[PDB]
Amino acid sequence: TDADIAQVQVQNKLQLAMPLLPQEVQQQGVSVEKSSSSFLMVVGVINTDGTMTQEDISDYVAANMKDAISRTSGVGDVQLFGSQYAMRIWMNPNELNKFQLTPVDVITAIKAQNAQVAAGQLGGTPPVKGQQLNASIIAQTRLT
Amino acid sequence: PNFFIDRPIFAWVIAIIIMLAGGLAILKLPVAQYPTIAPPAVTISASYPGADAKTVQDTVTQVIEQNMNGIDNLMYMSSNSDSTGTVQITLTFESGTDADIAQVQVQNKLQLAMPLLPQEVQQQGVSVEKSSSSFLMVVGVINTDGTMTQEDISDYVAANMKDAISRTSGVGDVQLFGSQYAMRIWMNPNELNKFQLTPVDVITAIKAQNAQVAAGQLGGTPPVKGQQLNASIIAQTRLTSTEEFGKILLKVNQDGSRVLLRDVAKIELGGENYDIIAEFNGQPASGLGIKLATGANALDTAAAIRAELAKMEPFFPSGLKIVYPYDTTPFVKISIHEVVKTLVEAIILVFLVMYLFLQNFRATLIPTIAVPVVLLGTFAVLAAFGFSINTLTMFGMVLAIGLLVDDAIVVVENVERVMAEEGLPPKEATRKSMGQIQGALVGIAMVLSAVFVPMAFFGGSTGAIYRQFSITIVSAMALSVLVALILTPALCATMLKPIAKGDHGEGKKGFFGWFNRMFEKSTHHYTDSVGGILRSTGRYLVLYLIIVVGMAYLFVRLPSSFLPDEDQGVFMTMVQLPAGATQERTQKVLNEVTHYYLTKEKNNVESVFAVNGFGFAGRGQNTGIAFVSLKDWADRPGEENKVEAITMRATRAFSQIKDAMVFAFNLPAIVELGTATGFDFELIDQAGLGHEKLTQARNQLLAEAAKHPDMLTSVRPNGLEDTPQFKIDIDQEKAQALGVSINDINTTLGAAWGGSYVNDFIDRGRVKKVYVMSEAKYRMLPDDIGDWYVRAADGQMVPFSAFSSSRWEYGSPRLERYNGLPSMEILGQAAPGKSTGEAMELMEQLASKLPTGVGYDWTGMSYQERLSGNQAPSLYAISLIVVFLCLAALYESWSIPFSVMLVVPLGVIGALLAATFRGLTNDVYFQVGLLTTIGLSAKNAILIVEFAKDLMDKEGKGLIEATLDAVRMRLRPILMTSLAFILGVMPLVISTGAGSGAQNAVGTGVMGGMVTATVLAIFFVPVFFVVVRRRF
Amino acid sequence: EDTPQFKIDIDQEKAQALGVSINDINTTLGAAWGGSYVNDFIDRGRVKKVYVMSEAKYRMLPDDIGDWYVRAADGQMVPFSAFSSSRWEYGSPRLE
Amino acid sequence: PGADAKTVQDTVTQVIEQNMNGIDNLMYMSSNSDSTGTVQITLTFESGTDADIAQVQVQNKLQLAMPLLPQEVQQQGVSVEKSSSSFLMVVGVINT
Amino acid sequence: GIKLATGANALDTAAAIRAELAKMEPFFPSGLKIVYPYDTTPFVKISI
Amino acid sequence: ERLSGNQAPSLYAISLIVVFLCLAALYESWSIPFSVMLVVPLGVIGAL
């Protein structure tokens, strides 16, 4: 069978199911691959002078190496032995109680205080006759 | 061979089938200016209305990129992120990748990344398209009455033209220049604050009141027993009128008085976006970009498009015209007609050279039947290999008439010489003479194929070009040797009249043939002058070495090129105002550009399509472009009236008057090419280091490049410099206290200053968008923030100044990424002296000493040229060995082949001598031209050596005697071909007008090569043989 | 052939005046007459649909509209005859 | 869901058909629009055409129209498939 | 852990993955090393 | 049907040409085919 068409056809169906899945599932990214079962190879990464932990190394691989490898033609699947860094907010319930707060409030705060915002432009188009200035209006950007 | 001498009817039948198959091919073959040459590239496009370069990047660009995996044959990926809110991600695939599969693979990886992009982006859509910039035609649609604006025009084109044009046969794609209408709601903040309402209220109302509402049906299943009637219940449907949007209720005051959208906002049909303003000769302009459908006829499709446009003419509104700024068709028409003219004028010149050399009206008809059978047969072959009739295939055939004509002449002449020498009857003379040439013809065919086929195997974009010439020539040459073995001898046997022994036509006719005496004296003089220069032979080998050294020296000092520039009836100038320039400020400059071309180039310039907003650097109010159509060649007589000169004084004119940078140039033949002597560099951020640290490093490289003007010239970044930008800081603590919603704040700023795509509505039976944005005057200066108010929970209205603060800063209007990582693109070229490779190496050396974490790569043509540069010597090494081998087999020697292979330089020298003194360039048409010249140079020699070896082996003649007999009996045909061929190329050397760039490139090298090839080999070939044939 | 259509004009103006939500009036008419697909359940180990719709006898005639009530923002029940007109229209169920 | 034939024709069908240009070997095209809000567009190709390339070329063009389609249509999924026209067989099931 | 796409050439892809890895090594943080704990490829080459 | 009807005259045109061309190639005569071609209508009438 043509592996390309096998994928194309499969995916055409998956997409009918796609909007019926839970949001939490969708935004984790559903993937459709055309791969061999077994590993071609394992590329391992260590640190000689011992200046970064395995989670540091995992993040590096994920942030600096993976994408390029997975884009390489003939690479059907890439598995990371470890995880990429994320912003970890480890909640304390005693303190959450202590202040009359729930994880729901934490989530609601972060969504609003950590956002990219499209704010439009100064002297944007269509302008008034005679406009002399034109700049981006920058508002809220993601935290770092 | 002998088979068909006794079967002239069989041979005629074979000829007839070839004619029919070729006629059927020529009739239903695709035609286009050029075939596909560029590696397939899929472009992902997206727009986040009101977003900045950083917002699009971090929200759309990065996310999508991070999901382009498990896709086959990806070469590289690059992207942009403009503060026009737009993202473009281009994925380029390996040569020969299936474009359709590529685009599908890309589109459904994107499909799985959609739920991760913001909803404003999702609802705008994400384009995924094949990116072949080739247009067949650009149709401009303009108004002259001054009644409709480019927005009105655009919508008319959408609803009453586009569909119909895309239905037209051979039309593969139709891009609209402009938007379909949008419901445009321009908001007034004064009026909003009066009734204490926000854009948020404006949006909510529109969604409530312009919506589709699923209801149900009467008598719907499962029904009651004995149900009477079943009909659909229709609840709320979408609005239509601009009047209806005005009637929507926003708020009812405490005294019961209504507040409508009409009362807070201007409501009108308008453009989806106002970023570009296009003008044709100063007047409002929209248009369609038309692409030619794969496999279709460019000529017929043009004719059809124009015919469909003629039907619609009487149905247009008062003032609207259809104009044609860009049409590739007129140019193609010329290329084809001028190629067929060369071919036919080549056949007539065989007729004339055959007749005024063999004085026999029946003998002259044989090659007149032979070459048209071959030519038609060639078309049949191209059809069978899916090729098309295009500039490259058509100039392939003109390049091949030297070989096709030669096969027809050599066969016929030999029979004519055999009868005039010995006295045998026509059929028997044909039998005998064919026995003298057969093996040699079957050998030459193997040799010629061994010089052409290898170039079909060149890689990348150039290889795709070289293949076109290769297969076209190979197939033509193969068929002509087959016709030489099948058809020509049958004709030579049946329609050729006998000649009495030792005739030579000396004396005879008066008023017609006095030239036989004159020709016979010279051919005796020549064989005298050869025998004498066969004495001291070791001194002629020295002259040869000077010819070799001279060839080597002219090879190095002839500049390289791809394809010659053409006066394609069109060019374009580009406009660049300094960063942060207003639309109006660029409009002024474009107006002046148009005034120059219509005032001072009134006689030449037909039209000036100014596009204010779109540019080649980026997009924005800052930049524009001005496309120039011309009165056709027929009206532009001299050299100063051609594109090269027009554009040069245009760039001169704008340097001494402007405060903005206004270039002027003409487009390359294949409209996706590199500058030959120019490169495409990409600087990469490989560690953490941000945008600024990269900018730092780029400046380090740029400055270092200026340190070497002797090696690199005009080295520059392709991107954009950092501009100031206006940052508003929402105090979250202050906002919470006053009671304003953080999201109410954000969308009130967004909707007003950026625009906000609310809804769809149905305009005259067509779904179009609904936008809400502030009126122009309340969103211009930073002082206008004071006009905008948000409503807090406790009811009251709150100014931005209460919860926000602002300050300026430098940001980036255009962020670039290459293969996933932050990039900055650098263009540049090798200095007037040096080559691209030498420049590229110096570039790599400079980049090796940049700040730790900075990397680099080559993209575009620099990437192409890198992967296919170690091929030219390797392939033509395999060419020679096969040529030697074939020849060894042909004869019965490992040495004898050398005598013919030493001819190679004799043709090349005069080609180089022609191109250098004509100031022409070493391009593709020159390379393929060269191979043609060597082709005959070998052919001429192979037969001479063959004749000498047979007279030596079969009759026991001496070496010094046989070579003299061979050069003599073959003096005639060489001169006959080389007269007809040089005169057939005559007009192609000195030519002006359309397509002359290529015609010159083909002709010059061929005529100069064919002069030295033949008026040199006739002395050197009999020398080569004797020299080689003396070490044994 | 062209079919009759029953057009209901849910008056937004009169709907707010009585307190009722515009969404509440929509999804009551919609779910009663057309049915609504709420979510999924598990029948014998297989995921199937859950639909909510009127009993046949209250969604057959123009006069059956009256039977349905919407709750206002205060708490009392408001009939459709309070905030909606209705009329007949034509149009094709199948456009080729 | 719940759109009349006129609504879906110029809201869904037209949008798709416009982009349905620039596809190799297309012999002709036909379509329907329902009172049930169903649209079916059929691209019929030249004899001999590779149906798997047809499918790919169609869905490539379709996925340009997708943006401009109503969200309701978008979240209902849009299928592109090689279609027959008539049934090979009709298997029947009854209880005795 | 890398898995071949269906039908892709094992040797060619391994070749490409190595080439990719060579592009990255120069820009690594201090003392960060690539190591090859599992590769089915060197067998196929030597085997032949 | 419409396509089948339109090609039909072109079908016989080439088929009669191809047979005539074949016969000339087999029997070295240019006119021997002319006489056998005249037998076509004798058969065709029987079909109709």
Add this chain to the structure above:
Amino acid sequence: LGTATGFDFELIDQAGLGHEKLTQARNQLLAEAAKHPDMLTSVRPNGL
């Protein structure tokens, strides 16, 4: 694709019996398969 002499059996619920009924059906199969040692070896669930 292949182990010397190994099979790959799949037990399937075709009447909507459920997880726990299928489990009871599995254990019964495995029991019987242990009662034939001179035919089957290592008849095991591959799952959890």
